[PDB]
Design a protein around this nucleic acid. Sequence first.
DNA 1: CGACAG
DNA 2: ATCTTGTCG
Length: 223
Amino acid sequence: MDYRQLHRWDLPPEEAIKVQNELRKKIKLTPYEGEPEYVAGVDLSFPGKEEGLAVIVVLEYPSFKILEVVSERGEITFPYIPGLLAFREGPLFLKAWEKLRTKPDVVVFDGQGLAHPRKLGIASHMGLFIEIPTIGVAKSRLYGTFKMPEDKRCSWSYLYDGEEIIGCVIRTKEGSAPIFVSPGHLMDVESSKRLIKAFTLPGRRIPEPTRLAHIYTQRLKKG
DNA sequence: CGACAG
DNA sequence: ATCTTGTCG
Ligand SMILES: [Mg+2]
């Protein structure tokens, strides 16, 4: 499954950031109306200090049926640095993406999207490469301010960057902590919340695209 | 000084 | 993310 290599990955943090500020300029926060047919999810596990195993799950909507699953295990050199995750989990994902045969209508990542210090989280960054609509679903905050929603099964609040709306916090499960949703590329707030609320079966905290992509991500690190 | 996706 | 088993609701 093709894509566009917009630049090189091995860059000292400082350049990587200049790359991000430049890229943020090509983001299209357009709407996504209508229901999707094919929906994928991405995640990475780490079998070794510097070895990561990437995994992509493509699902049939709304039957949530698993139509295809590819992977790619490899070396990881760029260290983890809040705000620069794309330069870590990004390359190995693209290696797995090449093995994919079904065309996703929208891919969903395990990390921020618009809710990033420079408005370019891994979700944003990858959408630009593979030019498909993307969303970012994270389990903790990185950027933006909000009002912790009620602990009621479907409550929610908006994620702000001042007066600007950049995402939203949803409590998809009682007793458990909220998730952080924000648009990648070719996507907007009101749409992502809609869709994400749609991909989360009752009783679970995390949506199926990512919740399965993770399971395989850990499992493949063993049996 | 604090904060800081995975 | 990862180190780790049982245990509490
Ligand atoms: Mg992960």
